[PDB]
């Protein structure tokens, strides 16, 4: 995967070119916003469980039939196969906020999963729900700088579902 | 220990310890002298802050020591309290070490099936290790208590 | 009690509504396309790299 700092790095590599003052603004940037990360990274590790309890209690609530009997999150093992999904989703968009960098998005959860959401039923409109439900929730706990830091993984998670 | 981390990882790899690796054991030795403070702070004052987070405790959970309660009388409550103690010890450990491995093999391994057999309530655990944290946080800098929250954070996560 | 003391005495502003900002709103409009350009021009930078040559 890559960082903020590999991403320039990766840049000026295949360019050939040292760092030059922008690459050095980008670096300064990510170290400044590092802090923050870090901070928000720790709020989140500390607060998985209760995000998604809260989460999953507004998906279900917007969308009732999903854990009635003929919806997609009936059954025990289905309900579990849906929370698990819900954090694996927290747990690697608390990821890319650390690096400041969408990558592991793309190299650990979104490629195939919509074609196996498809194959299995899953809805993926009803997932996409639900990680806005996480995003809200997170949100709410991280303040409004980690807020605006962590939506933009949260809405990377969305578009890549939608 | 973050040390122990550092060099598991050089072992791994079949190699020395790497720049990353010496400059992460170089930091925690740097922080040692605040994780002293912080560790003898806690230490010191073990006996205030479990008596003040099982009182808020049971004064939040009324029914853990009403009849039929799980810590009912008065060799439940020690139990109880010891675990509490418990907990807080590893939190000075993790503290001192500078990772999670002390509290993990202690304590937490084994914790959760447990308390699952023994029909402990795993809320009211978590109630009283928060009351923990605010009664460390009370005698703490605000720094020393964003450090020692680290910890206590981390175990009520692996509770929860 | 015999000075004269003056008590409500009416306001500077007229009693009409708020004008509308319609033509603010549009010169606004423009601002924000202009910021837009300068962030897309290092993203369409990024775009226009080479495929697989991490
Ligand atoms: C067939 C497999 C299956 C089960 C069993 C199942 C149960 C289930 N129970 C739920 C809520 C609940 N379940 C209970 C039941 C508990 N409360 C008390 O402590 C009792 C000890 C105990 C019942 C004997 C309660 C009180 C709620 C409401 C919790 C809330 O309001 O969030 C929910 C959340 C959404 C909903 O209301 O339907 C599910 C999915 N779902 C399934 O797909
Ligand atoms: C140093 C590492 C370590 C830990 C962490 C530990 C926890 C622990 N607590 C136990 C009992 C207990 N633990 C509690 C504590 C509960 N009472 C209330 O409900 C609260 C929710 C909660 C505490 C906040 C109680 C009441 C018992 C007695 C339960 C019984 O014997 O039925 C037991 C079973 C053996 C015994 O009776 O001593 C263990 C292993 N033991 C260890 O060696």
Same mark, same amino acid.
């Given at each position: ?18 760092? !030059? =003052?922008?690459?050095? !603004? ?6 400044? =916003? ?6 928000? @990274?720790?709020?989140?590790? /500390? ?46 968009? =608390?990821?890319?906020?650390? /690096? ?63 | ?97 500078? !990772? ?30 928060? @009351? ?25 996560? /692996?509770?929860? | ?35 837009? =350009? ?17």
């Amino acid at each position: 995967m890559q960082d903020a700092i590999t991403s320039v790095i990766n840049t000026y590599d295949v360019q050939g070119k040292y760092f !030059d =003052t922008s690459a050095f !603004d980008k670096l300064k940037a990510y170290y400044a =916003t590092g802090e923050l990360r870090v901070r928000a @990274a720790g709020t989140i590790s /500390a607060n998985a469980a209760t995000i998604i309890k809260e989460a999953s209690a507004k998906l279900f609530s917007n969308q009732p039939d999903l854990v009635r009997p003929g919806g997609n999150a009936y059954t025990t093992r289905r309900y579990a196969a849906c929370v698990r999904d819900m954090d694996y989703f927290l747990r690697y968009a =608390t990821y890319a906020m650390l /690096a400041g960098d969408t990558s592991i998005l793309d190299e650990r959860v979104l490629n195939g999963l919509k074609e196996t959401y498809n194959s299995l039923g899953v809805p993926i409109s009803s997932t996409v729900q639900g990680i806005q439900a996480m995003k809200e929730v997170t949100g709410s706990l991280v303040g409004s700088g980690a807020a605006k830091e962590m939506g933009v993984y949260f809405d990377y998670l969305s578009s890549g579902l939608s | 220990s973050a040390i122990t981390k550092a060099i598991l990882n050089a072992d791994a790899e079949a190699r020395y310890l790497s720049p990353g690796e010496i400059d992460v054991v170089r930091g925690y030795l740097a922080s040692g002298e605040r994780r002293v403070r912080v560790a003898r702070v806690l230490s010191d004052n073990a006996l205030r802050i479990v008596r003040g987070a099982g009182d808020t405790m049971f004064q939040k959970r009324p029914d853990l020591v009403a009849p039929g309660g799980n810590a009912y009388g008065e060799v439940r409550t020690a139990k109880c309290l010891r675990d509490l103690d418990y907990f807080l010890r590893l939190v000075t450990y993790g503290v001192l070490a500078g !990772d999670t491995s002390p509290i993990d093999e202690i304590g937490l391994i084994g914790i959760k099936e447990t308390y699952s057999l023994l029909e402990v309530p795993v809320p009211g655990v978590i109630d009283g290790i928060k @009351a923990a944290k605010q009664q460390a946080a009370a005698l703490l800098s605000s720094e020393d208590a964003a450090e020692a929250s680290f910890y206590f954070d981390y175990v009520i996560s /692996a509770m929860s | 009690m015999q000075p004269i003391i003056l008590r409500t005495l009416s306001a500077r502003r007229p009693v009409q509504g708020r004008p509308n900002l319609e033509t603010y709103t549009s010169e606004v409009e423009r601002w924000k396309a202009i910021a837009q =350009t300068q962030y897309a021009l290092e993203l369409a930078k990024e775009m226009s790299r080479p495929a697989l040559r991490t």
